[PDB]
Write a protein that binds this ligand. Sequence first.
Ligand SMILES: Cc1ncc(COP(=O)(O)O)c(C=O)c1O
Ligand SMILES: Cc1ncc(COP(=O)(O)O)c(C=O)c1O
Lengths: 396, 396
Amino acid sequence: MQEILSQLNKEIEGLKKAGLYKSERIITSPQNAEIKVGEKEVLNFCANNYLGLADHPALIKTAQTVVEQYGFGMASVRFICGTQTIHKELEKDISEFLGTDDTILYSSCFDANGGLFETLLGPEDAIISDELNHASIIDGIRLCKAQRYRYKNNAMGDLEAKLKEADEKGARFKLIATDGVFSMDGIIADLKSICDLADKYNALVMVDDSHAVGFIGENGRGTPEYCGVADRVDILTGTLGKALGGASGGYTSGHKEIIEWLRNRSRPYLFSNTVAPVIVATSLKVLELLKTEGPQLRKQLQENSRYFRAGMEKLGFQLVPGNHPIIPVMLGDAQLATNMADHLLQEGIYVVGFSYPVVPMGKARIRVQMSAVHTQQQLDRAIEAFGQVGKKLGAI
Amino acid sequence: MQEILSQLNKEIEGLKKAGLYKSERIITSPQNAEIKVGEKEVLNFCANNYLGLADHPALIKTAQTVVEQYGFGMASVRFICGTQTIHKELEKDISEFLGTDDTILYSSCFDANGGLFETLLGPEDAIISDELNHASIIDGIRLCKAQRYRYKNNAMGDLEAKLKEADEKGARFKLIATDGVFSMDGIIADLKSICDLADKYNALVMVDDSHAVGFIGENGRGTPEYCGVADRVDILTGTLGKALGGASGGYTSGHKEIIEWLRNRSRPYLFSNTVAPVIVATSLKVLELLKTEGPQLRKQLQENSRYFRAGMEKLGFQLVPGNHPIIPVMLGDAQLATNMADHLLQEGIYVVGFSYPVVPMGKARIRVQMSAVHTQQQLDRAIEAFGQVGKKLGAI
Ligand SMILES: Cc1ncc(COP(=O)(O)O)c(C=O)c1O
Ligand SMILES: Cc1ncc(COP(=O)(O)O)c(C=O)c1O
């Protein structure tokens, strides 16, 4: 026991002595545009609260109603006695929203991805992944006998070469796995091209739409709707702990046969407690909102993004091009990102800088994220503070 | 393409006309001793709701306040802006209940187990696991690089053979992984022996107490307390989707540097949404209850089990000797299990039978699960039904 603590403590030193010790800030308030970090009231540009549903009053009311209506817990897997009218209804509605045959409910999108490939593909098959796919995807693939191919980020490119390589090896089924959006770039994937390739090589298309479902696309359906390739994407995974409430839960959606197979085989779906009625039921209210407030919030979101883009290009900051609620401010320097984020926090602005190994070395950045609730005053104070700390640190 | 819908269909027809296909029933009420599967009101004897906290008025009343006080969701991982004052506190209270220094939260014990092994062990190590260890563990080992060893269930035994065998190939760090309670048997692991073996062979000891924490032991602290090996187990995984609420959530608690390392390296913890505040704070209420209502609730379960035990033996039913809320009713063949389960349902009793691969061949069984909120009358109705059906199906 001590032998390993003689090995853990030392390694932890290396982390701290390399500026890699993850120390958590304590949020002393519900999730909103305005939050309390410690005792400090600051503006929030950190959370994946894309539509500001995290603390939406209509949702917390529903939450208070449904928790009593359905109880607090089911203490069982879906199969045994953990399936309720809510669960089938939510899976039914998500499918209607995305326009798919059926949906399978998970405790998260992390599990949804862990319980996808192993169930569907075997050794006689091949998975082809974008380099920067989510970690859950990465670990879902590792739990799979299929042949593994990884192509450069949005290379159509390194992809096709990966398709030929796989196609010419003798793959029975070829699945193309990729995130709808790249969490560090705010760049949206090229589904059109990807789908166009899936056809020539007779492959399947899987798309993790976590940072897209709810706000991306005309009706906020995500990348498929955005790229105009709807019904070309074979598999659709996603979370609910992001744009949709932000509590937890995840899903996979698509053709009846794939979902049924997962529902009978997916190990996370078979060996894990069912999602909480509190969040399943409240999620039903969230879908209702997208239909009523969605449009407004999606328009508020785009305008917010646009407004923040202009003020930041004017200050001198260079931002990765794009049309997404995620706005990476390229700082290149690891320490610079840290310092600024640290200073910005004092200016009432809460953000977080990412560096290697999260991103490449010399490509560090601060990932600012727009919410449908971010007012103009808040956007001005943020931009303003990005100037204060921007010139103070010689960034601009 | 369409080519995969055919191989899925041609394999689904396999499971269907083989009795393997799974068809979920829909619970149309909260979780209780008295529930209604579909429209019919039956008694529930197949839920992991051991203390009956699933639909406990106090917990429900706490959920209503907390969600308003803390919001519906955080829409962020722990590190960035997902850690509330309530998340740290919970971990703290979890560590006090058990005898651990710190505690890390997961959205489920399925994530907890998965992000445990690979994070903590390398290729120069070795994990020695029981045969019937939960999938969470198995899947968790499959992500790790350590050499894997599987010993016969509760063989002390074959275990020692796999420990000698582990060293025979030079494992610097070796870990013993096991369930605290074996789900299909209701048998308590031999923690005393296993720990003595950790000593003699210098291995660590990790226990998964999803089916123990809350009701097993004098104070419900689980199998270590029960087996009197307190302060001899290094790693403790557990869930909140059973005895401690039934909502959702998982954890890993133990020594200092281990849980700090996990908090910095555990993938599911770095790449998955934070546990819903509604459930975090409510769980805090669960633990408070376990201080006052705990004692009686454990006692009730103790009596209940004995009562049902003896009652079924009167009818000549063959059980598996144990001191646990999990009472396996040995049925032998698969047909008996499912057919008896079905008849009981119509008799007003809902239980689920299991057979290969869930259990060894020619060793099917109905797993009856005791709750604290089970009445003697309800026990008489159930025991009664098992007789009526046992006689009719020619089992007794
Ligand atoms: C022993 C054991 N560990 C872990 C788990 C999983 O926990 P959770 O339902 O929170 O994913 C279970 C339940 O299936 C279990 O029985
Ligand atoms: C692409 C992607 N996949 C998977 C996940 C994990 O989902 P969850 O937070 O529900 O576990 C996320 C969450 O950020 C994600 O962005």
